[PDB]
């Protein structure tokens, strides 16, 4: 009682390098985008892993290859180390997700296909439970490629802007003063305990780079 639709799912091919590299050929056509397997030597770990001359790379070591250059695929392998893990889909599966308007990945390996239709007030998820004290101030990069669509920027990144919000002096003295005049001297000690661990370089990003470390 097995449907041909449920078998339509990715497969993570894991192959370790030993005999002069992994032993597989990868190279995109030319003007056509995407990366495909040209061929693989027989009796090789790549072949045993499940890699075929008709497979498409969707993710490497669990990284997103979508929107990445063709040089990114090899880069991911090098970053992985002496071993690599390539995610591929079946011929029917590949087109199955494209017409379904979905994004295959390692997450699809565990759990049922996206074909099921379900809904509710909250989405079910078995997330891990952990508790920790949040830092008062420290590094914390934000998203700049998610739903970016239009161009925008925020200066909220820098703590304590150029000018504060001035308010009327009110009475000469009152309870709970917002005046740090006297406390100003105390703030002097903070100088020694300074911790400018933050960093802001002018090179936000590069328009385009093609160093091409190596070309198979």
Swiss-Prot record:
- Please give, as recorded in its UniProt entry, the membrane topology of this protein: Peripheral membrane protein
The induction text for this entry reads: By estrogen.
Q: Where is this region: Disordered?
A: 135-216
Biological process, per Gene Ontology: actin cytoskeleton organization; adenylate cyclase-activating dopamine receptor signaling pathway; auditory receptor cell stereocilium organization; bile acid secretion; cerebrospinal fluid circulation; cilium organization; establishment of epithelial cell apical/basal polarity; establishment of Golgi localization
In what ranges is there compositional bias, type Basic and acidic residues? Answer: 206-216
Question: Taxonomically, which superkingdom?
Answer: Eukaryota
Disorder this protein is connected to according to its UniProt record = Nephrolithiasis/osteoporosis, hypophosphatemic, 2: A disease characterized by decreased renal phosphate absorption, renal phosphate wasting, hypophosphatemia, hyperphosphaturia, hypercalciuria, nephrolithiasis and osteoporosis.
**Assembly notes:** Homodimer, and heterodimer with NHERF2. Binds the N-termini of EZR, RDX and MSN. Binds the C-termini of PDGFRA, PDGFRB, ADRB2, NOS2 and CFTR. Binds ARHGAP17, EPI64, RACK1, OPRK1, GNAQ, CTNNB1 and PLCB3. Binds PDZK1. Interacts with CLCN3. Binds the C-terminus of PAG1. In resting T-cells, part of a PAG1-NHERF1-MSN complex which is disrupted upon TCR activation. Forms a complex with CFTR and SLC4A7. Forms a complex with SLC4A7 and ATP6V1B1. Interacts with TRPC4 (via the PDZ-binding domain). Directly interacts with HTR4.
- What protein does this entry describe? Na(+)/H(+) exchange regulatory cofactor NHE-RF1
UniProt source species: Homo sapiens (Human)
Name the gene for this chain: NHERF1
């Amino acid at each position: 009682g097995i449907d041909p639709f449920t078998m339509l799912r990715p497969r993570l091919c894991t192959m370790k390098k030993g005999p002069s590299g992994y032993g597989f050929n990868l190279h995109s056509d030319k003007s056509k985008p995407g990366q495909f397997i040209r061929s693989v030597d027989p009796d090789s770990p790549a072949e045993a892993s499940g890699l075929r001359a008709q497979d498409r790379i969707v993710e490497v070591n669990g990284v997103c290859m979508e929107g990445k250059q063709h040089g990114d695929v090899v880069s991911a392998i090098r970053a992985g180390g002496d071993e690599t893990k390539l995610l591929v889909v079946d011929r029917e599966t590949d087109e199955f997700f494209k017409k379904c308007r979905v994004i295959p990945s390692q997450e699809h390996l565990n759990g049922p296909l996206p074909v099921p239709f379900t809904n509710g007030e909250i989405q079910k998820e078995n997330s891990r439970e952990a508790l920790a004290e949040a830092a008062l101030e420290s590094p914390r990069p934000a998203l700049v490629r998610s739903a970016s669509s239009d161009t925008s920027e925020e200066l909220n990144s820098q703590d304590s802007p150029p000018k504060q919000d001035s308010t009327a002096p009110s009475s000469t003295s009152s309870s709970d003063p917002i005046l740090d005049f006297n406390i100003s001297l105390a703030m002097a000690k903070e100088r020694a305990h300074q911790k400018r661990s933050s960093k802001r370089a002018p090179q936000m990003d590069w328009s385009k780079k093609n160093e091409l470390f190596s070309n198979l």
